[PDB]
Ligand binder design. Structure first.
Ligand SMILES: O=c1ccn([C@H]2C[C@H](O)[C@H](COP(=O)(O)O)O2)c(=O)[nH]1
Ligand SMILES: O=c1ccn([C@H]2C[C@H](O)[C@H](COP(=O)(O)O)O2)c(=O)[nH]1
Ligand SMILES: O=c1ccn([C@H]2C[C@H](O)[C@H](COP(=O)(O)O)O2)c(=O)[nH]1
Ligand code: NA
Lengths: 138, 137, 138
């Protein structure tokens, strides 16, 4: 499907918004003030729950300006389709300054990543030979 | 819709889905290791796998370890043609060392669907959009 | 409709390239020298713009080798299909070693992540009950 169902748990929540015509993601808004400490982390409230479309999960991904200006990086970020709790935004602050967040600030984005969510695990003896082979971390 | 998993030793665990319609498969450490505070490390899995056509394997974070322990996955892109042992790269952004024991779930594998057969083509200019050059706002 | 269009904004830019026959990503090249300081961050110029295919966004993802050998993690990372500015690579350096970048170095990789870009947002009083429910961060 294409339907993203959103539950607003309080008057402090904001419906996520699409910031441009073919934006990858939807802006997620803080529903409560919080400070993320320098070289530290915290969890931003949203007061929202959602059910992403079948064939996706909801990825909480960085708002680009916050990364550059404030050293902010999203942590965790995988929202499962069966999750009905409040979605929380985990933020790492890699800068030397505490970062102030106010209720209604855009703190991250939600991307409806398409995935294979019905895969069959098959245990095998070996994998198909490739030119890459075992080469990694080059 | 087939994920082929190779178990390379007795210390490997087949990855597992943590709920009915979980996005990801939990990945298990095959070794004990410490991820130093404000540092990083690499966790063995003793597994290899081949992701389905049109996907790559993203090594994504477990949510509890991020909140409780400051753990974040690094690197994280497993190509479909990789046949080596898959490694979990971990950053510890906390002030506390993080101990991992053999058999702990240290990350999750997500089969991210991608366009892996694009034609890359050089153009003089892109389609004009409302967004334009607007970035990092 | 599987075409990735790349605009080279200068002689210093390099068209991104696949590093193996079925690599997930296209390596992104620095167009200008820069140093990412130990326990710090920076922005890498590419002098490229691109329009990703319909149904995707461009994710600027980390190169594996730089993560383990240099402590490098990409920040931000979400390039919208309608972006026509210069694409910039945000790098965090989590190591104690300044990371020296030279024009022509591979600095990140571009992954054409498939997403639902035409979802309909529907606000509901409650989500469908699941066995997971509000269970998160377990
Ligand atoms: O960025 C975080 C990542 C996870 N979750 C919630 C939703 C997910 O389904 C997750 C699942 O928790 P465990 O399965 O790791 O317990 O917790 C948060 O709200 N957002
Ligand atoms: O978190 C990491 C990311 C990379 N790899 C391995 C598998 C990938 O295919 C990769 C590619 O190495 P280079 O192409 O970056 O050398 O190395 C690890 O096992 N897991
Ligand atoms: O790693 C970064 C992530 C974002 N952008 C650019 C392209 C995106 O479309 C973005 C959008 O800016 P805001 O919408 O966050 O203002 O800016 C960078 O070039 N690369
Ligand atoms: Na290779």
């Amino acid at each position: 499907d294409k339907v993203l169902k959103i539950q607003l748990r309080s008057a402090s929540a904001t419906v996520p918004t699409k910031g441009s015509a073919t934006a990858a993601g939807y802006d997620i808004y803080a529903s409560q003030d919080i400070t993320i400490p320098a070289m530290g982390q915290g969890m931003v409230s949203t007061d929202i729950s959602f059910t992403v479309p079948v064939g996706t999960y909801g990825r909480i991904a960085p708002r680009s300006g916050l990364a550059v200006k404030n050293g902010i990086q999203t942590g965790a970020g995988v929202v499962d389709r069966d999750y009905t709790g409040e979605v929380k935004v985990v933020l790492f602050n890699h800068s030397q300054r505490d970062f102030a967040i106010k209720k209604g600030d855009r703190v991250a984005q939600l991307i409806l990543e398409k995935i294979v969510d019905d895969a069959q695990i098959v245990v095998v003896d070996s994998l198909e030979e490739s030119a890459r082979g075992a080469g990694g971390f080059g």
